[PDB]
Every structure is written in C-alpha cells, then in structure tokens.
Design a protein around this motif. Sequence first.
Motif: not given
Lengths: 487, 484, 483, 489
Positions: C66-93
């Motif tokens: 299941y965790l390996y499956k979660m790893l697979e999904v996370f890999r597909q979602m990287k761009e989404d996470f980066m976007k939200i960490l910047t605009v919600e959290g103020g983080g630089t690229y």
Amino acid sequence: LNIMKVANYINGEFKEPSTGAFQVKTSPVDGSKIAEVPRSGREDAREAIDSAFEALKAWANIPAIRRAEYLYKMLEVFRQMKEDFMKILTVEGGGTYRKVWGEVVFTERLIQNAAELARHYQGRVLQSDSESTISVVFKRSKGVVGVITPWNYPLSISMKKIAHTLAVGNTVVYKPASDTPVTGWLIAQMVAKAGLPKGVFNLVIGPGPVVGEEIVTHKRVAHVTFTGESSTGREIAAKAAGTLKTVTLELGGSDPLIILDDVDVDYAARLAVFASLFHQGQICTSAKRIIVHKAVADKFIERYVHYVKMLRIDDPRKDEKVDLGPLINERQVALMKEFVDDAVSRGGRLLIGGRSWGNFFEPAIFVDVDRNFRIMREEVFGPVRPIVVVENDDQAVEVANDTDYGLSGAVLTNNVNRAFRIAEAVESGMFHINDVTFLEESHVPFGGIKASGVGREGGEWSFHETTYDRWVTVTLRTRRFPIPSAL
Amino acid sequence: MKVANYINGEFKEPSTGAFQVKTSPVDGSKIAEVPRSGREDAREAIDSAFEALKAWANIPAIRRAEYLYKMLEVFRQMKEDFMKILTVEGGGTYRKVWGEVVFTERLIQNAAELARHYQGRVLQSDSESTISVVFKRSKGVVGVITPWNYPLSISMKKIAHTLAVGNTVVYKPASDTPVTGWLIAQMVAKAGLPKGVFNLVIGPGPVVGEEIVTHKRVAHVTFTGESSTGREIAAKAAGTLKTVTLELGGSDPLIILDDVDVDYAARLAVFASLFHQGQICTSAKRIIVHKAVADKFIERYVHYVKMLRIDDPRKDEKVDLGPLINERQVALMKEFVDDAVSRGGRLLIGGRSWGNFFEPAIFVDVDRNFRIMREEVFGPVRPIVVVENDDQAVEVANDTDYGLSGAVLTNNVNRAFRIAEAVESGMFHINDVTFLEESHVPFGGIKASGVGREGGEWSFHETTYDRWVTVTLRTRRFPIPSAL
Amino acid sequence: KVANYINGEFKEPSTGAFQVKTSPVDGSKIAEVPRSGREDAREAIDSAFEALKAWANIPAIRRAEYLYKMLEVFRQMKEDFMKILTVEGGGTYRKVWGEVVFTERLIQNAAELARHYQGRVLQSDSESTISVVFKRSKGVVGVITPWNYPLSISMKKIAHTLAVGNTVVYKPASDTPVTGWLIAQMVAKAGLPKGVFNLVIGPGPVVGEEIVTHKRVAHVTFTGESSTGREIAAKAAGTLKTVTLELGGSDPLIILDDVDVDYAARLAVFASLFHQGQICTSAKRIIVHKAVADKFIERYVHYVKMLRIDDPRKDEKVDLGPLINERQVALMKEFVDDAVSRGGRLLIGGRSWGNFFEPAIFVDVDRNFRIMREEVFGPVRPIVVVENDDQAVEVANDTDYGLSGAVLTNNVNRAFRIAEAVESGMFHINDVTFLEESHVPFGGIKASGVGREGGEWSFHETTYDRWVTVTLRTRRFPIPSAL
Amino acid sequence: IDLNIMKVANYINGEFKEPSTGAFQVKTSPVDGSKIAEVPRSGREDAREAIDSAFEALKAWANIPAIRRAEYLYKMLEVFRQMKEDFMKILTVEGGGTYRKVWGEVVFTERLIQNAAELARHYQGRVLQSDSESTISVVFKRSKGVVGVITPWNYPLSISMKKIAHTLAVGNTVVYKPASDTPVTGWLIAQMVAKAGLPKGVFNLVIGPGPVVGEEIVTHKRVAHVTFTGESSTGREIAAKAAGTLKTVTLELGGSDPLIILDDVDVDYAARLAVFASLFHQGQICTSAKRIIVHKAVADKFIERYVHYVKMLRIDDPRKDEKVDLGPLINERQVALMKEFVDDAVSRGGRLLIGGRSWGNFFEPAIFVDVDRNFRIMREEVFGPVRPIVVVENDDQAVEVANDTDYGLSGAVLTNNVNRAFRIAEAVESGMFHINDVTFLEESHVPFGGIKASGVGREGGEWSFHETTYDRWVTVTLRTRRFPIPSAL
C-alpha cells in the motif's frame, strides 16, 4: 612448578601423554631450564576431542546464567593467580614487567567480558510474509571448538578465544604454542580450580603438525579458531574443508603508521616508538611500517631515533622498568639478521641499532628504503622497522596499501578531513586515528582482511564465530497444496 | 537460439568461440547453443568486476537500491520469459516455475529494500576520550556458483543481495541451466548497471568455476550444490584465504505424530516430499511416522501419490510432475530403488521410468542401512519409517550426515517444541512443509549441509566485513622508554 | 473547495461550517476549507479504531505494498504539491522542490522498512523456557503538524506510523489545510482500506484537543511550539497515551578560527535564513571565534544583502518568500525592538511590508536579548563573538532548547570535543544545522521535546514490546508449603 | 540487625542525615503493630537538596567510562550479598512477606544488580548508511540526567533495585523515594550503596510523603525522567505533573491479569499453579493472577481442586518459621478494601466458596464463582487475596472475558494445544504473556511492562536503558558544496 609436573588436562584429569614422551622448555632469557612438558601425539588429541564431544550436550543445554557463573568463578581464580601468570609470561615468553602486567590486566577484562555477555546473546523475531506464521531465529552453539594459539601474547590471546567460546555453550580443545606450554598449563590449572564440568575444557601440549593437525581434521570438531602465521592459516583452512568445519583466522599484519605534517612531532615520535617496538615488535598489530610526510620527516626521524636510543634492553626479570626483553628463540634472531642484512645490501640506511646476543635483538631502524626490501614485503615479527618518506596523502595511502596484509593501521594528524579520508582508503580490518596501531578492547571486533585472515573476535563477535542461526517457524493455519492438482 | 557471456557491460562469445548444444530434458529437442568458456573468459570477468568495484562500493547505498529497484521493474516485464525457460530448460511444471518467479520478484525487492539499512555499531569505550565505532564494508568481488533445480530464485537471492551491499559479481550458472543465467544477464543489462558490476560466464564447473574459486582478486564465493563439490571448493578457497557461503543439500526429516489430522498430514507430506520431483534441497526426504497412525498415514499418502499427474510440463498448467533434469539423475534413482529392494524394502508404488521421467517410488520396511536413508536422495524416491515414540522419531531424524531443515506435524505444544529443539538442523518448521522459505530469513544448514546463511541481512553478513575504527581525543604517556 | 477525509469518504464537517484560507503572498483567496468540531474528530477516531484490527493483522508485506502504491501516486502529484506549498505556505520554488523530493524519499523509506522491524529472542535464566519479544502496533495514532514544512513533516509521521500497523487521525496546521487535503487525495487514490487514514481540518484547541484527550487514541505525535507540546503532554496523561513531541529549537552554529571564512559565511547564510528562518533546526544563534569574526561578519552580511526577496510564484530563483502571516511579522518586530533597546547593532535588514520581512542581523548582543533567550522562528539572527572554544560551548548551551547544532572547523580534536559538549539531540560537523535524512533519529532534548522520528525510530515510537514465554516442563510451587 | 545500633535517616550527597525540619514518623509492623523504627518525614527542602546533589554529580558520573560504573555496581553486588539476611528480616517484619517470598525477592534482587553491572559496557548505538555523499552518520547513546525513582510497598526491594541499578549503570544519577509503608528497605538500600562507595550525589535517598517529596521530584526542573511503580491513578497524576518540564516517564501501574485454563489441562496441576499465581504474597502482586477463567468442561473439577489447595494455605506470623504460606496485608486500609470487595460480591449474588474472614491485618483468601462483569472484583485491580473464577464455554469467550478490563499487564494460558495457546496469546491484550506458567513470571533482562491502564514503557536490562537514555544523531561531512541561496551566486 617446583612442586607440580606440567601435564595435559583431559576430561577433568591432569595427566601425562599416553606415550610418556616429554620435552624440556627453556627460557629465552638465559637458556635456563623451566620445566619438562608433554610431547603429546594424535591419541592424546583424540581423547581430548572425545571428552569435549561427550561433555558438549550437557554444557550447551544448561541456562546461559549457569555458564556465566562458571566464568565468574574462573575470573576469581585468575585474580588469585595473577603473579604466577606474570612470572611465567616473563621467564617463558621473554616479556617485560610492563608488557606482562598489561597482558594480565587485559586477560582479567577478557574473562569478565565473556561472563558478562553470556546471558545476553539474542536471536530475532521476524515479520512473516505469510499469514498465521510465527517466525523466529535462535542462537545455537557450534559444538566442539579447537583453539590453537601463538607464543607472543599466549595468555590474553588464548583466554579471549577460550572464555568467549565457552560462554555461549561450546566445549574446547586447546593446544598452546610449543614455545609457551607452561602458560597453557597454568590456564588449565585456573579452569580446574574453577570446577568446570569434566571435558568442557581440555589442554593438549604438543607439536602443531601432529596435535594441531588432528584437531583441525577430526570429524567431531565443529570449528577451529587460530592465531599464527598466514602460511599456517592457509594450511589449516585447507585441512578444515574436509569436514566442512568453519574457522576463525588471525594471521598477523604489516600495519602502517602514517604521520602527517600537522602533528606534534615529538608526541608522534613517542607514540611511534611505543607502537613499533613494544614487546620487541612481536605483535600482530605492531606498527611495522612507519610512513612520514616529507615536511616533518627530518624532525620526526631525529626524534624517533632519539627515543629509540633510550630503550633499555635487559633480562626482563631484573626490574620493573626494563623496556625490551629477548625474542622468543634463536630462529627469530636469525630471521631478524636476514631482514637487516637484506636491507643494508639493498642500499638502505641503518640509522641505529643492529646488534644481537643470545636471543636478544636490538631495534634496527632503516630509512632510504624501497618496496622490494624484505622489511616492506613481509611481516617483520621483531624489532626491525622501516621509515618511508612520502610527498603527500595520496602517496601515504599507496604505500600503506602496498602490502599483502590488512590487519590494523593508524594515522596521526589534527585535520579531520585528512584523517577520515585516509582511514577510509587504508585497506585494513581495523584503524585508529591518533593512537597506536595495536589498540584492542575486550568487546570490539578484532581481525583483519587480505592475508591477515578471516573473522572477528572480541565479545559478541567471538559469539558470532562460534554459534549459528536457527530459523524456526510455527504455522497456525492449514492450507491447500498445489499437488495433486486434481484435488 | 544463441546465448553469450556478459562481461564488462558487453554480451560476447567465449574467446575460443567454442560452444555446445543444450537440449530439453522433456523430449531431447535442441534449445540453444551456449558458450563453453575457458579460464581466460573467467579471468576477464573477474578483472572487470575488480575494476568496477571501487566505484560501485563507494556510491551511497540509496544509489545501489535505485539500480535494484530498476532490476525489479525489468524482471516484472520478463516473468513469462523466465517461466518458459524454467519449464523447457529445467523441466519444471507451470505451478513450480510460477512459484519460483513470484519468489524471485520478492527476492530482488527484498535486496533493494534493505540496501540503505545495513547498520554498524557505536560502542562504549573502556578508555577515556575515545570514540569507538564499527563500519560495514563490502568484501569485494564475489563469485556466485549455482545449481540447476531452482536456478532462478537461488541465483537471484545470491546476486541481488550481494550487489546491494556494494560487492561486484562474477556469476557461473549450472551447466544444465545456462539459458536461465543468460536471461538474468539480460535483465541486469536492461536495468543499466555500470559495466563490470555484474558478469556472466557460462562454462564447465571444473574449468570456469575453479578459476573463480582460486583467483586472487575474488574475495568471496557463495555456492549452492552437492556437499562433495562444496568440500572441494572450500579446500581450493583456502589458498587465497577467501571466505565461502555453502548450501550443500539436505536429507530433511518430516515427523508425523499420532495426534495429527492424518489426511492433512498425508497431503502435506506428498507436497513436501515430491514437489519438483523431490529435486529440492529442503525436500522432505525421510518421512517418519508414529506407529499409532502409521497404517492410515501410509495408505493415505500412497493414495495421493497415485493421484499425481506426470507429463510434459509444457502441456498445461495442471501437470503435477515433470521430468528429472537428465538421464544421470534417472540412473541414480534406479540405484536407490535397486538398493532398497535388495535390502528388503517394500515397494508400495512407483519406480516406472521412461526417458527422463520417473514415477515416485515409495518404500516401507526400510532400515538405517538403506542408501535412501544414508544419502541425499535428490529425486522422487522416498522412505517412510515407522517409530514407536518421540524419542525414536528424534533418533531417526538425526541419524543423517545432513542438517538442513526439518518439520514436525502435531497439535501438542510440548511435543512440538521438544522435537524442534532436539532435531539437529539449521532450520525447522512446526506444522508446515520442510521447504518453507522467505526472502529475508536465515536460510542454511549445519553438519554436511553447509556453512553460512542467506536471505536479507544474513546475505549481507556473508558478503561484508566489520571494520573497527577509533578516534582518540587526548594524548597520553607511553610505557617505553621508561627513562622518559 | 477542500473537505475532510473520514472512513474512506471525502465529506464536509458535520456543522457545514467552513472558513476562507488566503495566500500569505498577497492575501488573495486560495480555498474554502472545513472548520471541523468535536464530533468530526470523534467520527474520525471511531473510524480509525474500527479499521485497526484488520490493518494491524495483515502481514507487513501487505502494508508495504500500500505504501509503495502511495509512492506511485505521490510521484504523479509532485507538481500539485509544489504549487500549493508555494501559494499556501509562502515557500520558494527551491524550498518546495526540496520538500517534495524529501517527501518522496520518506514514503519510500517507510515502505522499505515495514517488513523488517524485528523483535528479540532471549536467553532464559530458567530451564525449559522459551523467551521472546514481539513488536505490536500501539493502535490509533493522532498526527498533529505545523505550517512551515507541512508536507514532509506530515508524511514522515503518517507513512511510518501506517507502516507498522497503526491507523491515523491527522489534523494539519490551520495555515496549511490544503496541503493536508492533497495528502488525503493521495491516500484515497492509493486505495488504503477505509478508516486506516483520516483527515480532519479544524482548530487545534477544538479538533486537536479531542484527538489528544480521546480514549481510543493510543499515541499522539506532535510537531509545533514547546508551549503547545507541554499542553498536549498534560492532556495526554488523562488516558495514559504516549506522545512524540518535536518542539523547535534555537540551534547554535559554531564557527572556529581555522575555517574557510567565505565558505563558513555562505553556509551560515543558508543555514540561518532558508525558508526565512522558519525551520525548527534553523541556525538561530551564530557563534564565531574572535580571530575570524570581523571577516566572517563582513562576508555574512555581504551574502545576506544578495538575497532576493519576492513573490515566490514569480520564478525559480527567488531566495525568500513571505512569512506565513501578519502575526509572525509582528513577533519579528518585537524581536527587533528588544534587540535595539538592549544595545544591539542592526547591521542590515528589518524592513517589512505585508507578510514580507528583510532578514535583520544583529551584533553586540548579550545573553539577555530575547533573540538569544527564545526560539526565533523567522529571519532575525544574532551573531555572537567568543574568545575560545570553552566560551563557544558555554554560549551554545545557554538556551532552554536542545534540538540540533553544528560546528565548522578542520580540527578533529576541536570538532569532537565541541560535538560532545553541546547539549542537543542532533549535531553536525561541517554542515548545516538542519541536515535531515529519512531514516535517522530526528529529535531533541531539553525544551525541544521527546522521542525520535525517522525510519525505525518512528517505529519505536508507535509500537510496543510484548514479552511472551512458553514453559515446557511442570514444577513444584512454594505454596501451599505442606504439599 | 536490631530494630530498636536502628538510626534510620535520609542519604543525601554521600551523608546520612535527618530531614531539614527534624520531623519523624514511626514505622510499625503490619504483623502486630510493633514499632520498627522512627523514620524521617522529609519535606520539599530535603527533596530539593537531593536533586541538587544528583544534578551536581551528574557530569562526572556520566562522563567516566561505562566500565567504571560497572565496577561500582559489582561492588554494590558484593555488599548486597553480605546484607542478604538483613534485607530478608526487614522485608518480612516491615513488609509482611513470608520467608519464601522474601528469600525469592532477595535472590532476584541479587540477579538484578548483577544484570545491570553486566550490561553497562554493552549498550550500543548505530552506524548508519548516509544518503549523502562523503558523509559519516552515527548515533550515540546518552544518559538522560537526574532520574526520580518512586516505588511501592509490595516488592519494595526488587522493584526499587531494578530501577536504581539499571538507571545508574548507563550514567544517570538518582533521587529515590521509597513507599511510606516500606522506608527501612530504602534505608538498607542506601546503606548498601554507601558501603559500595559510589561518588557523593550519584545516589540519594529521601524518606517522606509522596504528595510532598514525590511531587517535588516530579515537578523539579533539574529532574530529567521519573520511573514510577504504583497505582494507575497516582501514575496519571504524575504523568500530568511531569508534562510541565517535558520530563519523560516510565510507569508500571498494576494489572488485573487473566489466567486462562482450557479443557485439555492436567487439572490438578492447573489448580496448584492457579493457587500460587493468584495468591502468593496475599495476591499483592501487580502481575498476580487476579481473574481466573476456566473452560466449562473442566470447571467443576478445577474449582474443587483449587478450593482444596486454597483451604490448605497456612496463614500466620511470617516471622514464625520458614513454611508460613501467607502473611498479613500491608495495613488496615488494605483489609478494609478487601472487605468492600467481598461485601460487594456477596451483595451482588456471588457464591463465596471459601474464606472472607479477617483478623488484624491478616485476610483469609476469599474465592468467588457465579460473578458477572459488574462485580467490583472484575472491574478493579484487586490488590489482595480476593479472587473470582469465571466459567466460559469456549476460547472466544475466554478471550472476551480476559480482555474485559481496563488493565493490560500480563496474562497466561494453560493448555497443551499449540494452536489454542498461540491464538489466545495473540488475542489477549497485555504487555506480557506466558503459556503454561504463572502470570507473574519475571526475569532481570526482559521487557517488563503493560499496555492500557497498566502503564507505559518497559524495564529490565537493555529496556531499562532505552527508558533512561536518548539517541543522539551525529554527522561529519567531508566535502564542501554549493548552497541554493543566494541564488544569484
């Protein structure tokens, strides 16, 4: 010794070899007679092995705490016998007061260490990839263990092997070096006074190629732990294969002591003298090849020679401050002569030393050496030492690794980056930053790589060598099987 | 089909061009032409592994894990290919080679999972101002020499774990399963491991194998095969003080007590004793039954043996048994049958043979002098021995030179544990088959069955060494010269 | 519009209450997020509790899958996470890239270790006795996280806790709810059994307190302020649940006289000011040997001046984004006000606009400055000059905190003596104070908290040992004696 | 020794002395109320002095090599062996233990001290694989600091020494507050430590009220950890108080352990085992078998045999001779509580098979059947000799009754069937579990402790070390690198 004959110890009894043959042991100090000792043969070894084999199941099956108890009793008897051991290590082995005191203190810690660890050697509980399955791993003792030892540190090396091997439930057949039989007999006296069950520990005094070979080739011996020359080790390893017994081999060293340009030069010299010449250089982890950075090479050499000049060589019985005793026998003196003569004829510069008399041999220090000198290519188990000058750290490492051996090693420097890079690059089983090459603790993994042998001894690493893993499972559900497929 | 060595990143012919033809144990049809390599080829592979060693050992573990995860990905794409070769070259049934491939996937994964986690120790120093730690270091170039019965999973257990901790590999597969080895090299090639990290050399054991075992740049040899071969490898290895891991087969006891579900015990026993035609090191080779259930057990066991379907394993997915690997194996099984009959054994069923096929031969009225009690029977000939009590069961169980695995069937917790404790074996299983095996458990034997353990971190223990390193933070005075 | 994730279903709070999350960059609307209450928390807890036995009892290899499956999904979602960490959290690229890379490794690390967590087989002091120790999961675990590294901190806790067979109730920081919702999306897509992982978005004093005080929660792992941690520890005692607490730091960066001074300054600037200094293991107190202090301070200020502060959305080379909210700016002004009033010399910085703040660097400070006595979770940094190694250690340890620390020097003796002497849970020679790997024991001493997280250390926090014996012989008992 | 060459005092910073205020109490025997000794009644000042003494001793004790600390513990072992008779006498007259109970406690205590000495040098950290290039990554073990040790009255010697010996071994210093009902045992411990010559301040003894001395220990900022054995309620209060300074705790809080008996047992043996397990030391044991659960197929015969052996128990002055089976409870408050348990069970329809009388502090084992889950003796820890027997129809039922408790310390099952044994072991919610043995099995080096209301953490050998040390990650980076800010660079 003045009231007891030296004898074998087999199945709880002190006794003569079956043939009655004996040898006279003499002191390397002055050739005086020490004792008549057994010259045992194959029948004696076989009897000890059978005694060890018959004692094995009862000794392995008691709880660890009961074996720990016997070892604590042994420790108590050892403390009572300290002066006897020191005396014999000096007169039979040629060790100075300071050397044998060190050996006896360490032996006390070794025995205690083995006692301490006996109850705590654990196996593992595993995750099973299957449902309804318990999966664990037990530790089991290997069985009858042959212990074959050298003459240079005969007490501590013997007791490290014997105490730890006994702690985890093996029984023992012990054959000491022919040049140090009385030390082995005192060990048997210790074990007997501690009252270990008969056959759990046995002593057989006799020739390596006879008694030792019988131990190495016998089908009832499970494991041999051996310390000695690399050539002997190779032979033992090959003979051991016949019955698939495992081995632990510690086979000597040509340890590098690397000295960089940022050191306290005077301290470096003091350290180097101790590391390279203690017990006349008859130590497997002696600093046998000294490697110095050219920026401090001149001051280091002057300082090293300065302190070497101070070394006092004498009858080690004379007083507590003698620095060096004799070598163990005349064969070692002749060999050290070959080393010196070879170095001189090859153009090497003898900075200091070179005289010998009886079994005594002075420190002999060389510079202007190259890689074809015998004292660079072979283990020099004696006080002949080359100093090699190098231009940088890359060269330091190249020279340090240019040996068939790989036991220990050391670097002196105050720079953390240079210290770690050199420690990583030197090919050795052990390495010491800012200390002597022969550091040793009772519970650390001691052993080498390359021609210096296989395996590690000390504390739980000794236990790893003389036990095996035992995977056991319990399956709590029934299941269907693939054959017959018609079902 | 043409098969080649894989040396330093390149598939290539042996340097003499010599080849030989491999045939199917099923019908004798040709399968491939494979190398007949010599010592020069072995030395070339060894030199390539040696040259690759430093770079491979000194990258971070996570990078080696990445390569192994790549290999896992490639293996997943090659499953059906591996299954076909294991069947046509090795004679395994669909169900058998499926199991081997599934386990192989888990083995490669297991090696990848563990690479980053193999730990050394920080110690208490008995001295002041001293740091004292123990690092793990890879041994170096490792020779891998394997058998023909489970050529994929046995090879990959050794190869994947050995690579994981930073060793490089020279691999010589069994002469009867060269194509499986070549497919392994294909998988590694496609995973893109650096050249020389993994090498395949196909050739005769006494030539290529002996070169691997005696070469001074090989640090360790892990071997699976006959005990006699193992003994000779151990002796040769001594010359350069290389270490060895040896798994040398077994004659495992399966002990059946009187409180069992007898029908279940028979079903379990048939699977454990005869899967892959009994050509398994941990096959249940000596069956030991308690007197009180012996008659009923023996009847049921033979009943299920009778149901076994022996056929061309290529035919369909439900074939129970295929052929033995070659005619030499058939001849040996005939010797075992000949010996048992001549000593008064009662042949309850089986013994028919044709080509490399053999119908399981089951004996009772057996005693300790029978060759099938004294030797590893690596094939489908099995004794059932009847004992009167647990003491006797244990006596019989231990009356062997071997000591690989073993099992006891019983519902009684006291009898189960007492028997498990007393049986002299490296592995033991309560209420399961003798050949239980997982990817991360210590697999190996005692006595004539060999030395060392493989599986997960136990594989790492075999192919690494401990390195004690200290830092001393204070200066001190030394005992010589004393005049100082 | 984001929602809770309870028992396999994305849903709105029981009350239907919500609030509006805005960007720290410009105040614009980001999303509507739940304002959950007690009953939402209780629903999540009950779901985790009902899922627990089935999740704990499958073989570890199933949880790893299941965790390996979660790893697979996370890999597909990287761009989404980066976007939200910047605009919600103020983080630089560069910051949110780092966080996402480390998060990938964290999830993988947990999957890798699941099958390998071992117990022990012991020697018994008694005859005929088998003695072993199994590992068991604690049960339902509450996960409560902060806003500075909301993805990696949450996932380290979540992935490892799941791996060994615990179920999870997760309450993210109120300033970073969308990141928590994206985590729930990933877990939903990975198809974990219902109830095994639950997300509840709401106020700490309401949702968090119900998690911390509920009967059926076995353990709480918390990262946040020391004051909050002390409150959680106190509340947890009522039901005897265990806690893991990571409570920030005031880490010393010690710079000795034998360093490459330019390199030390570059390292110091990264260590002290990355993510605007909003890191638990930020180099918050810089301690420099007098022999190189003048040159060090000059170069440090030189590199600080080069820092580009901007909208982190603009491009990949912005060095610093804004602080998370106006409250943080106000606190940093309090720190600046105190330093000036006590005689500190402001070498550079102090300017602030909206949530943005230019790094304020002080010298001439002493031990009574608030920026020496408190955790400064933002871009205000003291530099202290010391005369020798003893003084460096004295200043380094003169703090209630004890999370990490570092020394820069080429001297092996000085490096080790100082490493030994500094009172911290972690320490690094010749590297930044905020070094972190997925599988190492991460945590502090003193006010910085309790417990360790990362790989098997995370496993130790959320499992217990279970001693089991089998006795194989009968014996006589001492009572009744007459028998 | 003589109770009347006894004075009893605190032991602080290497000296035996009176409490600051000079206040004292009289310790009396539970056997007959006879005076044993005046003992201190210390206050917060004495506690603070002990804590400051331990804090000031800490750096030098933690920094010496482990082998030095092991040497001190071996010396303690040597002294303990000389004091064995003295400890046994005080455990009996002060604590009410029979000869066989106190002999066992003293034998176990000897093993505990030895165990701590044995392990000191061998507590290891870890060398790790770094994911970064040119990085060395290791983990050290460090002692937590000053450790508060607060203990109960039932096994006051062995429980105190398990905590004290192991905590000292890994380089912590100790402030120790014994139970008020067993002060002389704590004083004998200080005497042992003093004779072994440990450095001043490394071990301190303060005798006084839990809510005064105990609470100062739990709330003081220079105390790093508290290890506590006592009631779950006390434990909860301590855990709450400790949060103020973020100190960690080890809590062993008692139990209501199930003893499960299946239908395939030797019934006579099961009864003999159950009597010893449920009633040894008058049932005043955290891992006593407090709830007996028996399969209906053997329930009648088991109950008859169990009651038969219970009836055989000899209750007497434990000082009388070596074969007394049961002594008194620790005080009159315990007798009153046991009376409440009996009365509640009688009033609820329970069938009293035997016992229930009491005289002075002696309580006669009261055995009940026909109980249900609302009985106090099913809902509470019954730290005394009142025991319910519950009859069940199958294994599922056995497990449901076994788990129907707030507690979760230990447990046991008697059966010869390996599948039933393992299924029941796995299903029972306890920190420890024993197949075919007593519930209170305990060795010196195993992880002892519970789950649920029974507390947190494990003690024994290396597990005690885990509780009173922390991991410390240290790295060395051997290469320079470029940093992501300032990006212009």
